[PDB]
């Protein structure tokens, strides 16, 4: 049960390192993607 929190915190580490890398690239070419409005 306590081993579950160690692995899902490791998932955040993996998910976020992904979002960062992808965001960097998106800006390096077509940042229009990142518009909200």
């Amino acid at each position: 049960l306590m081993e579950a929190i160690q692995k899902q915190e490791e998932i955040n580490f993996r998910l976020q390192d992904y979002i960062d890398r992808i965001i960097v690239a998106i800006m390096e070419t077509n940042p229009s993607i990142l518009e909200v409005k």
Partner: protein, 175 residues
């Protein structure tokens, strides 16, 4: 009715997590405030056009998570920055010094910096007397204003100001 623009200014929001950056953004762009809003993931920006000296200025307001540790890309091309703290959390103000370092490191010089100034609506909770900050603002070469995204006070004024000051600086270098 125009849809076309004379100037395109990129302005970035920075500051400790929870000072209200995202709501400054939403309030300015779509006049919406969310009391229960969650932490901002990734990077976004929203746009709005305004009139300054007869010319239409298209503002590109970028927002991201205040907790930081992709910064280079974020500040790039930014001609303006809203450095935000929580009037009611002295700690987010203490960190204003830390944010200026990241600013004067990864962003272009000549960048207009405005100090905000947020959650002015909580009157009984104020930890940052206006003067202590306003002084800090003038001595470090920052404009300064106090806003509440919650009650709408000065949010519009804050953007209108930093935008015209960016207009003024770019028109004059053009002269």
């Amino acid at each position: 009715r125009d849809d076309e623009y004379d100037y395109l200014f990129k302005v970035v929001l920075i500051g400790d997590s929870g000072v209200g950056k995202s709501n400054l953004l939403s309030r300015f762009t779509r006049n919406e405030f969310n009391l229960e809003s969650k932490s901002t993931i990734g990077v976004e920006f929203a746009t709005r056009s305004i009139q300054v000296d007869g010319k239409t200025i298209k503002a590109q307001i970028w927002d991201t998570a205040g907790l930081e540790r992709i910064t280079s890309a974020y500040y790039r091309g930014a001609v303006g920055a809203l450095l935000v703290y929580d009037i009611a959390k002295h700690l987010t103000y203490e960190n204003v010094e830390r944010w200026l370092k990241e600013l004067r490191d990864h962003a272009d010089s000549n960048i207009v910096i405005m100090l905000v100034g947020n959650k002015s609506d909580l009157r009984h909770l104020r930890a940052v007397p206006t003067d202590e900050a306003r002084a800090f603002a003038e001595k470090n070469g920052l404009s300064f204003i106090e806003t509440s995204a919650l009650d709408s006070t000065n949010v519009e004024a804050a953007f209108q100001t930093i935008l015209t000051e960016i207009y003024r600086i770019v028109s004059q270098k053009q002269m």
